[PDB]
Design a protein around this ligand. Structure first.
Ligand SMILES: Cc1cc2c(nc3c(=O)[nH]c(=O)nc-3n2C[C@H](O)[C@H](O)[C@H](O)COP(=O)(O)OP(=O)(O)OC[C@H]2O[C@@H](n3cnc4c(N)ncnc43)[C@H](O)[C@@H]2O)c(O)c1C
Length: 375
């Protein structure tokens, strides 16, 4: 039996970020089922940072995370965590009222947000079909996230604070014993006053092992693919491109193009694979909107974006389950919110007020709590 102050289940971006901030204050042990910590959703994202995306709570967590991403502590990483990647949201269906509403709502959080006419949008991504473009919003502050550097920065930070990150340690049994949580894996047993459930799409399965009422988390499949651009086209500086109704997105990635139908098909928690129909739909939508020809993609994959009913993230203690803390419902936003979520969850776990910079972004304990979910 190994004792810790905080026992975290899951070493994806959620468990890693929470563990990183916790590790300055006590012994953190993170238990990860897979042989590597980023095998599931944290290794499958589009790795983008967009403030004007998700619910108001999501947008506040994303905005509050920028300070850490742009100014991490010395030794956290060797190169910047963010690289510039503006986001351009294009109206392909002639809906100026919706385009206006998205512009006005986005500019309220991003003062530099711009409204583009169709000619400006086509100047920025010249493969757009001009006759299908009716305008666009443009966020000059968008960024791509170096998810490997960020994730490993969190994980290394735990280990440098005498914490442990244990892979090939699937939590198989969970029990409340003598005022602490005990977790049995095949390879060992672990004990801590606080159990941090950061198991991604599996968070409700973990609650199942513990006898704790679940949140109603719904994993949703999103597929993506990479394909070659035409040889005479330099797309490496293009913004992230999204349609106004999030029917698809397209962005440069490693000399290639990354496309997606931006789907959200409800599924059970599992090692999710792309569906041929997902890929064909993404290819059709991109070819409908642009002059690009997509041969069979060179690489396809899918990951899980997991939501509770209201679309907001969850960080708080369970009702009537002492020491059981949820870090869940990261949705499509777990990377870009990870710094605020990790710092906020660590404060809440320790029963401390949220730091001032987080409260200045409108964050509070109430908007993160799982107990807000009414059945
Ligand atoms: C699929 C997908 C997701 C995107 C995408 N885009 C973005 C994006 O642009 N920006 C962003 O912030 N998030 C984006 N997301 C979302 C981001 O991927 C998720 O929000 C984020 O990765 C969720 O992080 P979590 O830590 O909550 O989930 P993980 O699956 O990474 O980690 C959970 C861990 O728990 C572990 N676990 C489960 N059961 C366990 C057990 N019994 N014992 C031990 N470990 C367990 C799992 O093995 C796993 O490693 C995207 O284009 C796609 C296609």
């Amino acid at each position: 039996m190994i004792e810790a102050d905080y026992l975290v289940i899951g070493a994806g971006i959620a468990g890693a970020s929470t563990g990183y901030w916790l590790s300055a204050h006590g012994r953190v042990v993170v238990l990860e089922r897979e042989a590597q910590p980023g095998y599931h959703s944290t290794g499958r994202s589009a790795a983008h940072y967009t403030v004007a995306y998700g619910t108001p709570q999501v947008r506040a967590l994303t905005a509050a995370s920028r300070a850490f991403f742009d100014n991490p502590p010395a030794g956290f990483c060797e190169h910047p965590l963010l690289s510039p990647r503006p986001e351009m949201v294009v109206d392909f269906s002639d809906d100026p009222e919706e385009l206006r509403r998205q512009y006005e709502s986005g500019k309220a959080l991003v003062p530099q947000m711009r409204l583009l006419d169709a000619e400006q949008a086509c100047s920025i991504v010249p493969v757009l079909r001009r006759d299908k473009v009716f305008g666009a919003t443009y966020d000059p502050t968008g960024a791509d996230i170096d998810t490997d550097a960020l994730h490993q920065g969190y994980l290394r930070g735990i280990r440098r604070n005498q914490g442990q990150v244990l892979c090939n340690h699937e939590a198989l049994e969970i029990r409340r014993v003598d005022g602490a949580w005990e977790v049995r894996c095949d390879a060992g047993s672990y004990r801590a006053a606080v159990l941090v459930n950061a198991a991604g799409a599996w968070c409700d399965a973990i609650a199942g092992l513990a006898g704790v009422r679940p949140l109603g988390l719904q994993p949703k499949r999103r597929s993506a693919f990479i394909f070659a651009p035409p040889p005479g086209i330099d797309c490496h500086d293009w913004p992230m491109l999204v349609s106004l109704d999030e029917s698809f997105f397209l962005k440069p990635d490693a000399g290639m193009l990354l496309g997606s139908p931006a789907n959200a098909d409800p599924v059970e928690a599992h090692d999710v694979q792309p569906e041929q129909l997902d890929i064909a739909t993404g290819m059709y939508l991109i070819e409908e909107a642009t002059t690009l020809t997509i041969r069979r993609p060179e690489h396809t994959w899918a990951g899980l974006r997991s939501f509770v009913a209201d679309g907001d993230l969850v960080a708080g203690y369970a009702a009537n389950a002492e020491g059981f803390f949820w870090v869940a419902a990261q949705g499509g936003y777990g990377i870009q919110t990870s710094a605020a979520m990790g710092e906020a969850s660590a404060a809440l776990i320790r029963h401390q007020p949220l730091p001032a910079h987080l409260r200045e972004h409108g964050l509070d304990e109430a908007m993160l709590s799982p107990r807000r979910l009414s059945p």
